[PDB]
């Protein structure tokens, strides 16, 4: 960020992670280019699934990790997460409190 708390960007590609508990499953990262800057930064998706949900080429919102940078656990080098794809606030789609738009 430019010192800010949030920023809006566009997904260009979707990467792959993996886990150890309770089994090995993909834990998902992406590459998101900043709209205001053009910088493409890695971002993590904290949830189960939601690789199904987000997309390529969608305009997303970004937030921090609450550790002043500083990648959380065994995720090497990601400093940001997505809270709102298309401004739809991921947790609403997480239960079924919202339905994804046309794109």
């Amino acid at each position: 960020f430019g010192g800010s708390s949030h920023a809006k960007g566009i997904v260009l590609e979707k990467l792959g992670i993996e886990s150890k508990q309770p089994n090995s499953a993909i834990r998902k990262c992406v590459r998101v280019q900043l709209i205001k800057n053009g910088k493409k930064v890695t971002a993590f998706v904290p949830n189960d699934g939601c690789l199904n949900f987000v997309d390529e080429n969608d305009e997303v919102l970004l937030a921090g990790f609450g550790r002043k940078g500083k990648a959380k656990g065994d995720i090497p080098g990601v400093r940001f997460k997505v809270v709102k794809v298309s401004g739809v606030s991921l947790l609403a789609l997480w239960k079924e409190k919202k339905e994804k738009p046309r794109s």
Binding site: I26, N52, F53, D55, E96, E99, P101, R102, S103
Partner: protein, 534 residues
């Protein structure tokens, strides 16, 4: 960005603004419609012959549209194409679980400028508690759904409805606030039908029979990209099928001429203009002597260094002549290559909101692909190891699958709409939603992993030296399959050592651990049998 950009410039007053008044059929929508044209035409027209062209100024022309909730296909069809959805409500909807599913249809087709209008609340409520109910329904929609929406509250003043400031507030919101662009609708040329005429090539014995199609001449105005760009092109008519245009019409020494006049040889084009096979890549040159002598000097390259339409058809055939009616509105679609072609396609899916059933492979589905809708058997599969290893016959709450099926083939991977049909006497809407997502990817000639289980129970086990009481009955099968690698439900490897002349399930076979009596010796990788075609 550019596909919305091409739409704004040529469109002006003769392309109208799309107005779709969509709600329940039980309400008096017609009073609000004729009230709306009482605002448009001076004060005195209250008759419905829609759809029809109403001329109102040079700013915007406005054609008004209607459809009941009893028609099933146009409930889909008007949703993807409307610039304006006008929802009228009664004071008793909100947890009516069978007649409000169209909201999710407009969600999946994409939300235009949409409206909530409450008028029968006056007919239903008469106390101060309706002010809380209005805000509560506002907490339901659209303010829950989309930020920046307005809820319109109007009077029940049935026939005899106002010309006053309230219709200027509605038409204020319609005229001032404009739409938002859609991705793939603007990627296609699409035309709504306005005037429908039929010519029969005057009377002959060939003009009627069991199979005779006549000359349907249709008229209207264009939207989206310009449709005249190529004659004889393909087209889709919704509810009837795919066709091609008979004739397209629209009512709103030059070497470049010499190229595409095919009655003239190219040597005559060059010869009249100035003064063979591209399989040889090396271009033509002159002789070594002439090019050497001419290129003795290098001076010659020294600077080289530092809208209304009249559309003709010979369709439809005879059976839809009996399907003539006052026109329930039909828009024309557009077919494209790499979308007109067929293929096995894989789609990504999730489950409908307020949906209460499981979704099986064996129950066919209606599928809205753009301007198309196909009943198709939805075969599901899943991965668990970044590759296919299993398949599922139905859709639980546990996970949500990916669909693979032979349908039409579409490379650009459009968004997905899977609707399950109900009759017009079951719930209240024309369809009930099954699953929605995006077309995931394109994949033809693919084969599904269908694995099964062979049952063998162990009772007294050593690592390399073991017998099963009951897993088989033939020593010949085990003798053919002794080179294979047998497994166990916890993951213990093994192979068949030998059938050992016992067609009874007892046979020597090795494992890398002694098999647990709570475990079962199994076998996987089984027959992948064919796709359902429909």
């Amino acid at each position: 960005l550019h596909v919305p950009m091409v739409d704004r410039t040529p469109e002006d007053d003769p392309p109208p603004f799309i107005v779709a008044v969509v709600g329940p059929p039980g309400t008096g929508k017609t009073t609000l419609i004729r009230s709306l044209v009482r605002r448009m035409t001076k004060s005195t027209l209250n008759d419905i012959q829609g759809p029809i062209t109403v001329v109102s100024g040079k700013h915007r022309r406005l054609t008004f549209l209607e459809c009941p909730a009893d028609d099933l296909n146009a409930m889909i069809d008007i949703a993807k194409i409307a610039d304006l959805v006008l929802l009228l409500i009664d004071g008793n909807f909100g947890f009516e679980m069978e007649t409000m599913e169209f909201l999710n249809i407009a969600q999946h087709h994409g939300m235009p400028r949409v409206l909530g209008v409450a008028t029968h609340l006056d007919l239903f409520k008469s106390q101060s508690t309706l002010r809380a109910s209005k805000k509560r329904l506002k907490h339901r929609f659209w303010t829950e759904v989309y930020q920046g929406a307005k809820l319109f509250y109007l009077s029940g003043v049935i026939n005899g409805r106002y010309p006053d400031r309230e219709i200027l507030n509605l038409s204020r919101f319609i005229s001032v606030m404009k739409f938002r662009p859609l991705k793939w609708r603007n990627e296609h040329p699409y035309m709504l039908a306005d005037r429908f005429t039929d010519l029969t090539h005057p009377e002959l014995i060939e003009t009627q029979g069991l199979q005779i199609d006549r000359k349907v001449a249709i008229y209207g105005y264009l939207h989206g990209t310009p449709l005249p760009s190529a004659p004889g092109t393909r087209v889709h008519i919704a509810g009837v099928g795919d066709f091609s245009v008979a004739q397209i019409e629209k009512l709103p020494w030059n070497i470049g001429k010499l190229i595409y006049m095919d009655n003239i040889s190219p040597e005559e084009c060059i010869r009249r203009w100035r003064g063979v096979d591209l399989e040889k890549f090396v271009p033509y040159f002159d002789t070594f002597e002439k090019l050497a002598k001419k290129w003795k000097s290098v001076d010659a390259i020294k600077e080289r260094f530092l809208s209304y339409v009249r559309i003709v058809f010979e369709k439809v055939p005879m059976e839809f002549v009996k399907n003539f009616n006052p026109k329930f509105p039909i828009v024309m679609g557009g077919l494209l290559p790499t979308e007109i072609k067929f293929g096995i396609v894989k789609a990504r899916l999730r489950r409908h909101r307020w949906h209460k059933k499981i979704l099986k492979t064996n129950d066919p589905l209606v599928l809205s692909l753009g301007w198309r809708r196909f009943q198709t058997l939805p075969i599901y599969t899943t991965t668990d190891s970044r590759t296919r290893t299993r398949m599922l016959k139905y859709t639980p709450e546990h996970t949500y699958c990916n669909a693979a099926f032979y349908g039409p083939l579409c490379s650009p991977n459009t968004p997905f709409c899977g609707v399950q049909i109900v009759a017009n006497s079951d719930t209240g809407n024309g369809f009930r939603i099954a699953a929605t997502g995006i077309v995931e990817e394109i994949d033809v000639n693919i084969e599904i992993v269908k694995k099964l289980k062979l049952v063998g129970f162990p009772y007294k086990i050593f690592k390399n030296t073991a017998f099963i009481k009951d897993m088989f009955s033939s020593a010949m099968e085990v003798a053919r399959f002794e080179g294979a690698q047998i497994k166990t439900v916890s993951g213990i490897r093994g192979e068949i050592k030998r059938a050992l002349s016992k067609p009874e399930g007892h046979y020597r076979a090795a494992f890398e651990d002694k098999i647990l009596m709570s475990d079962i010796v199994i076998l996987r990788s089984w027959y992948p049998v064919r796709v359902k075609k429909f």
